[PDB]
């Protein structure tokens, strides 16, 4: 659980800088386009910066089903 929480903290930090928003609004239930002011372009660039910051590689099809920040964190968790 603690490992998952630290991963979530790192993901939230990365999402904040990219979309230029406080860590306040990036909650697990926050939607990128509705709740964080990001468009598809912003999203694909956020997904990239997470693959570089965490050394992971999300396959194309997973990134397709990403609506809320929780989705991103849970994918990074399956890892």
């Amino acid at each position: 659980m603690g490992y998952l929480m630290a991963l979530f903290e790192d993901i939230q930090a990365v999402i904040a800088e990219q979309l230029n928003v406080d860590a306040a609004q990036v909650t697990p239930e926050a939607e990128f386009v509705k709740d964080l002011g990001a468009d598809s372009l912003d999203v694909v660039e956020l997904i990239m910066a997470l693959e570089e910051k965490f050394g992971i590689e999300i396959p194309d099809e997973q990134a397709e089903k990403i609506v809320n920040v929780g989705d991103v964190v849970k994918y990074i968790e399956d890892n």
Partner: protein, 412 residues
Amino acid sequence: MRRIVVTGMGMINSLGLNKEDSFLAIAKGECGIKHIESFDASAFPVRIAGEITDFDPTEVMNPKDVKKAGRFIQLALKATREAMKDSGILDAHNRCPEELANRMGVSSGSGIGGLGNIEANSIFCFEKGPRKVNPFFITSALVNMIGGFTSIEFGIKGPNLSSVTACAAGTHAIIEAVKTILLNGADRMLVVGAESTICPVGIGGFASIKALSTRNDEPKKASRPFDKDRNGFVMGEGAGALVLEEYESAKKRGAKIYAEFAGYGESGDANHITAPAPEGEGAFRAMKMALEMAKVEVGYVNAHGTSTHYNDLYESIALKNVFGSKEKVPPVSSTAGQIGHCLGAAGALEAVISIMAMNQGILPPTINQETPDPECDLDYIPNAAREKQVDAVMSNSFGFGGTNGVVIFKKA
């Protein structure tokens, strides 16, 4: 009220080296998409493109000069040579007559021009310093070198203009030539849109924004405008060329007359940098302006139709809105299934295709129509060409930055 006619045409693409072979293959519903071989794409998420595999630059250029021109310029020289020859304008030395030369210009279009050249020289400078930058780099990459090389090859000294409006550049290049002749700045204009960007960073640029079909296992099924299973465009290369001529001067010359220019429209979305305006509103306005200028009955529409989700959807909505209803939309087809979407060259290629469709009473089909999209409910001439005579044709182009261009040509 200077009237303007098309007196020569040329085109090269992944289905042919001239407009006869290419249009035949396109009307038959063949497909030129194949696995990429012009660079190593084995580690890429997109490995398919409309590559032209039978093109020999040494057939259009002195072999020593090939190194001087990006591939897009080489394709432009192929297409413009065909159209110039086709026009009957050239003298015994394949140059414009000297007493016509000052009043014949060139309008060229491309989205980025020599991207592979910039990528190559960028890597050279980064790895071995600026001494490894080739001196031919700049004059082989600039978009306007299409007009540079062609004006020199044909000796045409009129206005030398170049449009860089992304995927609408080919159509805007036609429109700038039309405007130039309308305002008496020239009596004839060579128009050419040309693009060749099948290179690592070009493919990488469009895959990075998820705009390209990743149907790598079936290249010939990847490009499928308006189909429900579309999933992004397929990048194509090519060039189309037209000779435009003021009407009285064409008749005096004994020129052949493929078509008469009828109208155009241009607009911007002012919305998003890659996505179209809601309901294709900018497309609607450009189409409306062209139709109200032309004052003719359009019997065929060559759609922009890139095989992306957004474009094909919002283009269909804007079409339905501008003609009034689905039933009032003329037959519509996108030929990007056959040759890929060719970016800055698409509008020039597709004006040639549209006009040939008019000339021959054959409307080429939108291929790979396997699953109807409920949101894409027009008549797309599915899978097979339709034998039907038409008296005017309309061609649409839209580009990143929300820039739209439309042209209509009428029978003559």
